[PDB]
């Protein structure tokens, strides 16, 4: 063959610009808005699903993917890119930290690992950056609850609150104004519903709005009963019915 694409194609410009990283943000903006609010006793993350035909089962498309039972992920930007990364995350976590240390990674560590893949993929030629920006919300014993934004440049940064997507800027000013140090999960939920409505004109109903949490303990879904001090899944996607009840308190 010969493939002459090894050479960087994210080459500097005369003003130091990184052409492909700048363009990737464009795909992010066409995303449907997602947001994350961190409280003292958990994390809530929220989004509206991508539009689809009614005829299509809307259960299948899910923008919130469980990556480990303790760490969930939600994105804004392209759909195709997200999937490949999600497999890749589950993969690298088992091989390198669940065979060695027998445990799902620490939350900052998983973010560090994803970030390298994004750095090579933008450094190296012939592979365009991922066109997605992630919010990885997780828990770990060592750093407590955490929320991190992962950019396609592969920089990752902790935020009290943030939003990515269409209306990321507007939503950030909103979230700042309602951020408190007495926040609860419940207070946070309230805010997320206000934010989401302002930024999305779509219909608000439990079958197309995702609300998913890092924080409820589940001895119940532990899947086994035999030592309850195990934390079990932190992740829970709220069930439709429950969601509907809280839309009374939109």
């Amino acid at each position: 063959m010969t493939d002459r694409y090894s050479f960087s194609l994210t080459t500097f410009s005369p003003s130091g610009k990184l052409g492909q990283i700048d363009y990737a943000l464009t795909a992010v903006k066409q995303g449907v808005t997602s947001l994350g609010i961190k409280a003292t006793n958990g994390v809530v993350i929220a989004t509206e699903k991508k539009s689809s035909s009614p005829l299509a089962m809307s259960e299948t498309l899910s923008k919130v993917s469980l990556l480990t039972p303790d760490i969930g992920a939600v994105y804004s930007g392209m759909g195709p890119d997200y999937r490949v990364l999600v497999d890749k995350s589950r993969k690298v976590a088992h091989t390198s930290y669940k065979r060695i240390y027998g445990e799902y990674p620490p939350t900052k560590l998983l973010v560090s690992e994803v970030a390298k893949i994004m750095q090579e993929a933008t450094q190296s030629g012939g592979v365009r950056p991922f066109g997605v920006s992630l919010l990885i919300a997780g828990h770990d014993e060592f750093n407590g609850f955490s929320l991190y934004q992962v950019d396609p440049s592969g920089s990752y940064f902790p935020w009290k609150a943030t939003a990515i997507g269409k209306g990321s800027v507007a939503a950030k000013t909103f979230l700042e104004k309602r951020w408190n140090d007495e926040l609860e999960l419940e207070d946070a939920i309230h805010i997320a519903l206000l934010t989401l409505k302002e930024s999305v004109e779509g219909e608000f109903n439990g079958d197309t709005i995702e609300l998913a949490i890092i924080g409820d303990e589940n001895p119940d879904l532990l899947g086994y009963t035999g030592i309850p001090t195990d934390k079990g899944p932190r992740f829970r996607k709220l069930t439709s019915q429950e969601i509907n009840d809280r839309l009374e308190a939109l």
């Binding site: 065979r99 060695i100 560590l109």
Partner: protein
């Protein structure tokens, strides 16, 4: 014959009230030539303590392997490697040479500083976790220690009641084993201080 018995020697570990203690003989030989009385089998990386039995050259290599891995752990995660995590890392590593295995027997000791749980662990060549909090023993005279330790020990021993118990337990058995003796070190590990005590005893 056995690679373990070139230097032989023993390591003993027990748990006490919010303490552990780990001790060992200082004897190092190459067969019937006693070389050194200054050799240490017990090393420390933070609050995780590791006495290693068996083939002397394999001990120095294992220490080094693990010198590297434990520091890289401390730097990236910004925290000492728990006894808990460490035991796992130990088990994976022994496994690495599945066949032609490592000829060494690690014994872990430490205090999970994050909860206050006394912790000790054992291992074989292939590496499996041998969990038993009352005691873990190892080496060429592991047989001898077992009788002694089970009888001396009474569940939940006071910090310095634990000190009498470990010290005697080692002393009696070690002279009565030809690949053990030549003094001892007794590490009394409590949460807020670690004391290191060379013990007066017959070198014979």
């Amino acid at each position: 014959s056995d690679p373990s018995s070139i230097n032989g020697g023993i390591v003993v570990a027990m748990t006490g009230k919010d303490c552990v203690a780990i001790a060992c003989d200082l004897r190092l030989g190459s067969q019937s030539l006693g070389v050194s009385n200054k050799f240490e089998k017990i090393f420390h990386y933070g609050h995780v303590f590791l006495g290693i039995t068996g083939l002397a050259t394999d001990v120095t290599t294992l220490n080094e392997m693990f010198r590297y891995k434990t520091n890289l752990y401390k730097l990236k995660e910004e925290r000492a490697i728990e006894p808990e995590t460490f035991t796992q890392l130990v088990s994976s590593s022994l496994y690495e040479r599945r066949f032609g295995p490592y000829f060494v027997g690690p014994v872990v000791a430490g205090i999970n500083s994050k909860s206050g749980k006394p912790f000790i662990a054992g291992f074989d060549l292939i590496g499996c976790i041998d969990e038993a909090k009352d005691f873990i023993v190892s080496g060429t005279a592991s047989d001898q220690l077992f009788g002694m330790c089970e009888s001396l020990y009474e569940p939940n021993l006071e910090p310095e009641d634990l000190f009498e118990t470990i010290s005697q337990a080692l002393l009696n058995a070690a002279d009565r084993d030809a690949l053990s003796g030549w003094g001892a070190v007794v590490y009394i590990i409590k949460k807020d201080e670690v004391v290191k005590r060379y013990l007066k005893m017959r070198q014979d």
